[PDB]
Amino acid sequence: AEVKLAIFGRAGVGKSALVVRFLTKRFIWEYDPTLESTYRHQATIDDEVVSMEILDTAGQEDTIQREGHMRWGEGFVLVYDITDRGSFEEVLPLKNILDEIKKPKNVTLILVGNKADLDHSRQVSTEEGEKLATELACAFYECSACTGEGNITEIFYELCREVRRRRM
Numbered sequence: 783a784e785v786k787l788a789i790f791g792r793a794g795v796g797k798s799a800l801v802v803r804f805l806t807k808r809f810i811w812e813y814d815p816t817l818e819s820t821y822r823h824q825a826t827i828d829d830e831v832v833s834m835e836i837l838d839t840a841g842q843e844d845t846i847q848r849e850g851h852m853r854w855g856e857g858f859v860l861v862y863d864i865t866d867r868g869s870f871e872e873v874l875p876l877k878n879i880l881d882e883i884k885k886p887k888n889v890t891l892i893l894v895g896n897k898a899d900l901d902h903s904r905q906v907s908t909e910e911g912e913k914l915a916t917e918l919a920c921a922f923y924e925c926s927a928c929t930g931e932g933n934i935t936e937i938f939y940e941l942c943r944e945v946r947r948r949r950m
């Protein structure tokens with residue numbers, strides 16, 4: 783069965799950059815901030831080939847369409863920008879919505895602090911991100927879609943492993 787992943791986060795945090803870094807192993811073109819799209823990708827993970835569909839969301843407004851995306855997704859990447867405190871503050875409210883939609887099942891998610899290459903304009907500490915991940919009961923990663931630092935491929939692979947584990 784295909785693993786269905788959805789990426790959420792405030793506009794501008796780097797959702798589209800992260801997805802394209804995962805799919806193409808580079809980041810060389812800017813991408814329309816308003817475009818929402820789904821990508822299919824096959825990867826060998828551990829022994830086997832796994833098919834995934836990844837939804838790169840654009841508008842973050844709380845709508846019936848957004849609830850549909852949350853019902854569709856099996857695993858979620860919540861992204862913030864380490865240079866932007868406001869984006870970090872949107873993460874827990876997103877989780878609360880997801881919890882309600884996936885009830886009675888547990889939500890499978892990861893927390894990603896992107897733009898780690900901008901350490902000099904950092905507003906959110908690595909420690910704060912770790913503590914928030916603890917509050918979400920999920921794995922935490924800092925990375926840079928721009929530089930590729932942070933092992934973005936392994937981040938997605940590990941979310942696929944978790945989705946599949948929880949399926950039983």
Ligand SMILES: Nc1nc2c(ncn2[C@@H]2O[C@H](COP(=O)(O)OP(=O)(O)O)[C@@H](O)[C@H]2O)c(=O)[nH]1
Binds near residue numbers: 792794795798898
């Ligand atoms: N310095 C830096 N800029 C980034 C990184 N990821 C994305 N960006 C930039 O941040 C802006 C928003 O990225 P985008 O992928 O469109 O964010 P989205 O709105 O969440 O899809 C663009 O100007 C990107 O070039 C990163 O890791 N480091």
Ligand SMILES: [Mg+2]
Binds near residue numbers: 797799815816840
């Ligand atoms: Mg985008």
